[PDB]
Write a protein of this length. Sequence first.
Length: 261
Amino acid sequence: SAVQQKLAALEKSSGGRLGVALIDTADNTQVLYRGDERFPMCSTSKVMAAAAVLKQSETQKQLLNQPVEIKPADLVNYNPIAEKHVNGTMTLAELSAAALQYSDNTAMNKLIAQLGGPGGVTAFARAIGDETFRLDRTASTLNTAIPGDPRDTTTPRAMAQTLRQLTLGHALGETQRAQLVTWLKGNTTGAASIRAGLPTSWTVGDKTGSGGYGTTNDIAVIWPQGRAPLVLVTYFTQPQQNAESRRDVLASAARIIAEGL
Ligand SMILES: *C(=O)[C@@H](NC(=O)/C(=N/OC(C)(C)C(=O)O)c1csc(N)n1)[C@@H]1N=C(C(=O)O)C(=C)CS1
């Protein structure tokens, strides 16, 4: 189709490897580009960890309100929220918001720990029917994005389906589903990625990721005017370890989709 050719041209112009999955919930049509190839997730895995804690809170009533100590050993590279609470506490709700809306890596690691480690995040993925997602390491290591390394990867097709199930489907209870969507709509890190390729009147909830090898990712639920919601996953990675981020490539992918379908 014309969209897949435009995505192939975008990829050629980029010098990298582009993976796209769009789900149009109006008729459940799916458009894939490298949709079954594995990409490093980087920080887009924070949605699965936040959703896993929300799932836990369906049966542990006041779980999201529980305080979690932030200790010196918890501090990592990038923790713009958690560093302000070292030797203090944050609630699991606050850690979820910090992970999703600021991509705070200390916050993510507190969620992973709350789930029993990377294997607990993965086990939740399996519980909601995602057999492709794998989380193998904590937040510092998970962004290394070395080519050929299957750790901390998924495919565009799998992540779009999972994001659909979590935000538009029935993977979470209704209060939890709404809270996840509220957090994604308040993301602060996504203006240059999928959002930049979409009309400004469309509502977006998204989670970005960035990592080594110029890896630049964004996963989004989109509510256009005049049509049913869309789920869009855009993954991108490059051959040089120190390649620069290409959020503009993600925005171009979104524009192709928004104009072409
Ligand atoms: C998730 O993707 C996180 N990414 C990182 O921790 C890394 N940021 O490095 C970049 C390339 C952004 C940098 O400025 O050097 C990273 C690269 S290699 C490594 N081990 N970690 C968070 N997510 C985002 C995001 O785009 O959502 C960031 C902007 C960085 S923190």
